[PDB]
């Protein structure tokens, strides 16, 4: 189908750009470290008296 080339071009034009993805895996590790630090602080402050 020759016109199927036009359909494929339209479909490709419809595809969103995945290059805008933010590889925030480092931010995920930072969040995990912050959560561990908060847990440690809460454990240190568990005994209020």
């Amino acid at each position: 189908s020759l016109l199927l080339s036009r359909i494929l071009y339209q479909q490709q034009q419809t595809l969103p750009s995945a290059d805008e993805l933010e590889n925030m895996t480092n931010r995920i590790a930072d969040l995990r470290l912050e959560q561990f630090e908060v847990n440690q602080q809460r454990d240190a402050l568990f005994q209020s008296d």
Partner: protein, 48 residues
């Protein structure tokens, strides 16, 4: 009889002290076990 009573009192006091120390040790050991499991889980995912 008096000597036996005194020995029993001293043994009971020592047993109470030992039970208190054992309870403190058990609490610390449970805390340590939890912390060690948590550290193992973290190091399983906290590489680099």
């Amino acid at each position: 009889n008096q000597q036996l009573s005194q020995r029993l009192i001293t043994a009971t006091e020592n047993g109470n002290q030992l039970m208190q120390q054992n309870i403190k040790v058990k609490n610390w050991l449970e805390r340590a076990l939890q912390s060690e499991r948590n550290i193992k889980e973290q190091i399983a995912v906290l590489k680099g």
